[PDB]
Amino acid sequence: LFLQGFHNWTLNPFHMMGVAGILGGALLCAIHGATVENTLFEDGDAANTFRAFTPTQSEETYSMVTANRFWSQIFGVAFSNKRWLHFFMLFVPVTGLWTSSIGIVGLALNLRAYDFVSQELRAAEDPEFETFYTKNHLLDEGIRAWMAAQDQPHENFVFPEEVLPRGNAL
Amino acid sequence: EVQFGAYLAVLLGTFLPALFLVNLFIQTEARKAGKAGGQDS
């Protein structure tokens, strides 16, 4: 909450890359698990398909061809190379984290992607222009002003009631 | 309003790498076609 309020960290593109990478990693994990588990081969006679596998096995346990066809018919593109598939699974979350780290290093120097100057101006010279962006800015100002007093006790911040920004009756 | 230098940044950063990749693919396909005998030399 502190980084959101003071740096507008959600607006930083590197954070967007990081969240894209993390969500894509979770997506890849779930989809690969489901695809492998739902394309198993008939290697037993019991309903429990877990006991039809042995670690010292040479042949493949699931039909790569059938999974490829299924995903190419449903989605439009599908994997056709297990090595590339697993390298992609490795690659996505790691690069997401690296991009997020670059963004945080940028924040450490207060070089934050806080304001869109054009929109800030055009809103300053006309009190009818409004976007969700300006609403986020108002939320940031509110959280900052109401949180600073207790977040930083060493500064001895004292804010009278008439100074704190507040909206209407609420 | 907006910076008039971004235009160049955005457009060049979109076009130059795209043409570089298209070049790589085209030359790969041309070499592949040249390796196999046929109407293409």
Binding site: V65, N68, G76, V77, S80 | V2, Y7, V10, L11, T14
Partner: peptide, 29 residues
């Protein structure tokens, strides 16, 4: 005037997506 640039970028991305589905390398066994 930047709305034109944004629209061009979005439509170009959509066209790239279009070409990657109907003009893909056919995987053969």
């Amino acid at each position: 005037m930047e709305a034109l640039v944004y629209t061009f970028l979005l439509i170009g991305t959509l066209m790239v997506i279009f070409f990657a589905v109907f003009f893909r390398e056919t995987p053969r066994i």
